[PDB]
Design a protein around this ligand. Structure first.
Ligand SMILES: Nc1c(Br)c(OO)c(Br)c(OO)c1Br
Ligand code: BEF
Ligand code: BEF
Ligand SMILES: [Mg+2]
Ligand SMILES: [Mg+2]
Lengths: 207, 200
């Protein structure tokens, strides 16, 4: 992923707040490692600019008129451009972050960061590495217990070596009902058989 | 030359504004605050020519910093710079004698220009927010407008009453409400005020 243009990078900035866009572009332009900065007020402008010339890094706000930076990210990847993408946003919504990562964003950082932080991010992605907001990583790495009350009881039974039929009896349900829960439980815990499911939910502290 | 303070809770923008201000030839120094409390604390110890204040910030807003600057009677010009178009903010800022109020739609070049403007004793009010706050609905009812137009044609209350098929007491009640609405001393003056206000 390393693009050996760290001393003369061509970037684009899409950001709909005009005072921030202007200030970002002025300071990037002054950096010795930056060759040029293309500026876009919204995601449709970004895309139009990227249709007509190459950039090494696109720096994208999420919330913008017409097309969001997430939509631009997806366009950039669908076009197979040789362009790193750095999302810079105010928003800590987990869904935006997950969407960016599913589109292979190179970095996702918050407007809590400084310009110096941003310059580091741009060198990191151009050298083929990723940078993900620590706060957003944390947020997303902590999951609820995904299991219903019944499913937990089943798993515990499973742990003790019980058959579905034995568990059925214990919970005063039909064998068919227990088999349904197990199916459900395999899918939720991304486990394969019934004993993987059991160590998965215990090791993740869910019983 | 210029000694400025910037108060702005978004870190990336505060950093970028401050670096660019610092680079300006007639800017001497730039003090930074990330909330209004920090801004008041800096202003307690250090003299500043101009304070550039965001509105929405934790703990104390720019509008509260502004008002503090004024009760303290400092020789500090104040420029508010905000994302928000909310009329209330602009109104409160002006009632506290803000020197400039501008939106983050504006450029950094515009901001510099605004700095020179306030230091020259002039004001710079967002053209958009000015137009918004000065644009209100006509304060008169349709019926009141018809009465005023009659008054402007020289008609008596009886003549207007016969024109509108109402009692002259009903016309007298329209006039009474008009006078109070418009704070006018008499019916002919009321018609003058309405006309020149663009309400007929
Ligand atoms: N992630 C996030 C964000 Br970003 C935010 O405000 O801009 C609010 Br507010 C919030 O919950 O109220 C959440 Br969760
Ligand atoms: F407009 Be936000 F910072 F994505
Ligand atoms: F935080 Be805002 F732009 F007043
Ligand atoms: Mg935006
Ligand atoms: Mg703010």
């Amino acid at each position: 992923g390393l693009v050996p243009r760290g001393s003369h990078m061509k970037v684009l900035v899409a950001e709909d707040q005009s005072m921030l866009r202007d200030a970002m572009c002025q300071l990037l332009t002054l950096q010795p490692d930056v060759e040029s900065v293309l500026q876009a007020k919204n995601g449709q402008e970004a895309i139009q600019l990227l249709e007509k010339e190459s950039v090494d890094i696109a720096i994208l706000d999420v919330e913008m008129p017409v097309k969001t930076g997430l939509e631009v990210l997806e366009w950039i990847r669908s076009e197979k451009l040789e362009t790193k993408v750095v999302v810079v946003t105010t928003f800590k919504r987990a869904g935006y972050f997950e969407r960016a990562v599913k589109a292979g964003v190179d970095a996702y950082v918050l407007k809590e960061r400084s310009i110096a932080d941003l310059m580091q991010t741009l060198h990191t992605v151009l050298e083929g590495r990723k940078e993900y907001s620590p706060e957003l990583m944390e947020m997303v790495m902590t999951r609820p217990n995904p299991l219903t009350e019944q499913e937990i009881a089943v798993l515990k039974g499973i742990a003790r070596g019980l058959s579905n039929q034995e568990i059925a009896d214990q919970l005063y349900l039909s064998n068919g009902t227990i088999r349904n829960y197990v199916t459900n439980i395999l899918s939720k815990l991304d486990a394969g058989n019934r004993t993987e499911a059991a160590n998965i939910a215990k090791e993740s502290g869910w019983l």
